[PDB]
């Protein structure tokens, strides 16, 4: 409907796949080459379904900060026959607050879904499902089951992936450029 939804759609149309684990279907953001991200609670194993294709996982790493605190991001390298468009130049370098963000989801349950979530706070610490978690972004939208892995964007930046909610607020894990230096 506007330039925010334009940037979000450009990311969804080229840089997302539907990932299925034993814990459900997730939006999955491809970042570069065969490297993607997913919430750590997806519990990625040796095999994952990518757009309903059985795919070997070549590597999977649950990120933690240097205080050894959960970040809720898992970086996956996929045994896929095709590379993602490289979007690392759209990743923030530092922790920040944002205006006018969109949360975008693409699953069997929620195809072509875009939510204007508004202002995004650098919230920091969250007890997420009982797990102390750092680098959390917060937005005042009542997000629901099915939106985990959703991509959070502003115009020109891919800033996070949706990892939870409390019924009134939604929470995303930061994406930082430094996670994807090769």
Curated annotation (Swiss-Prot):
Top-level taxon: Viruses
Disulfide links within the chain: none
Location in the cell: Host cytoplasm
Reaction it catalyzes: Selective cleavage of Gln-|-Gly bond in the poliovirus polyprotein. In other picornavirus reactions Glu may be substituted for Gln, and Ser or Thr for Gly
Active site location: 41, 72, 148
Domain Peptidase C3 span(s) in chain numbering: 2-180
Function field: Major viral protease that mediates proteolytic processing of the polyprotein. Cleaves host EIF5B, contributing to host translation shutoff. Also cleaves host PABPC1, contributing to host translation shutoff. Binds and inhibits host IFIH1/MDA5, thereby inhibiting the type-I IFN production and the establishment of the antiviral state. Cleaves host MAP3K7/TAK1, resulting in inhibition of TRAF6-triggered NF-kappa-B induction. Cleaves host TICAM1; this interaction allows the virus to disrupt host TLR3 signaling. Cleaves host IRF7, resulting in inhibition of type-I IFN production.
Subunit structure, interactors included: Interacts with host IFIH1/MDA5; this interaction inhibits host IFIH1.
Protein name, entry field: Protease 3C
